[PDB]
């Protein structure tokens, strides 16, 4: 049993857009844009919607770059996070109730202030390799187990 989530990384040649999460889950950490996938929308539509809701950005097209399953010790449901990237955004990022956007250079990504797993799979993201990840967490800071493999289709 798992719940679908989306995650969107606005990746441009020399920079990436991240949102400081202001309230709730993953608060105080930089991350891509996303959330729960709703009933009546595709995974890609939920990703575009969550990008719009959190950053005010529309996009020409999104591409599937990976799937990461997260297990939290004690919680029965897994988080099945579908990851997306994009280059051509439309408009300028604006602050929402959830997210404060900010550009970062690719060698200045604040992994110390992000979900610890990001360290592991970002390199594949930057290399444009598709991937399947799994991370078993104890609380929000400790990875107990993980797997990570290159794939051909997500
Ligand atoms: C647990 N480790 C993790 N590493 C990277 N991204 C994560 C994550 N756990 C959740 N996320 C992402 C998936 C969604 O885009 C968002 C959670 O949605 P929410 O902020 O609406 O609760 O954060």
Residue numbers in the entry: 3 to 156
Please share excerpts from the published article on this structure:
To determine the binding mode of N6-methyl-dATP in the active site of MTH1, co-crystals of the nucleotide with hMTH1 were grown. The structure was solved to 2.45 Å resolution and the overall structure is shown in Fig. 6A. The structure shows clear electron density for N6-methyl-dAMP, indicating that hydrolysis of N6-methyl-dATP to the monophosphate form occurred during co-crystallization. The protein crystallized with four monomers in the asymmetric unit (chains A, B, C, and D). The nucleotide-binding pocket of hMTH1 is comprised of a large number of hydrophobic amino acids including Phe-27, Phe-72, Phe-74, Met-81, Trp-117, and Phe-139. The purine ring system of N6-methyl-dAMP is positioned by π-stacking interactions involving Trp-117 and Phe-72 and two hydrogen bonds with residue Asp-119, which also makes a weak interaction (3 Å) with nearby Asp-120. Asn-33 interacts weakly with the adenine base and the deoxyribose moiety of N6-methyl-dAMP as indicated by the longer bond distances of 3.4–3.5 Å. The deoxyribose group is further positioned by a hydrogen bond (2.5 Å) with the main chain carbonyl oxygen of Thr-8. In contrast to these previously solved structures, where both Asp-119 and Asp-120 interact with the modified nucleotides through hydrogen bonds, only Asp-119 makes direct hydrogen bond interactions to the nucleotide base in the MTH1 structure with N6-methyl-dAMP, with no atom of the nucleotide base of N6-methyl-dAMP within hydrogen bonding distance of Asp-120. The clear substrate preference of MTH1 for N6-methyl-dATP over dATP can be explained by the hydrophobic active site subpocket, made up by Phe-72, Phe-74, and Phe-139, which provides favorable hydrophobic interactions with the methyl group of N6-methyl-dATP.
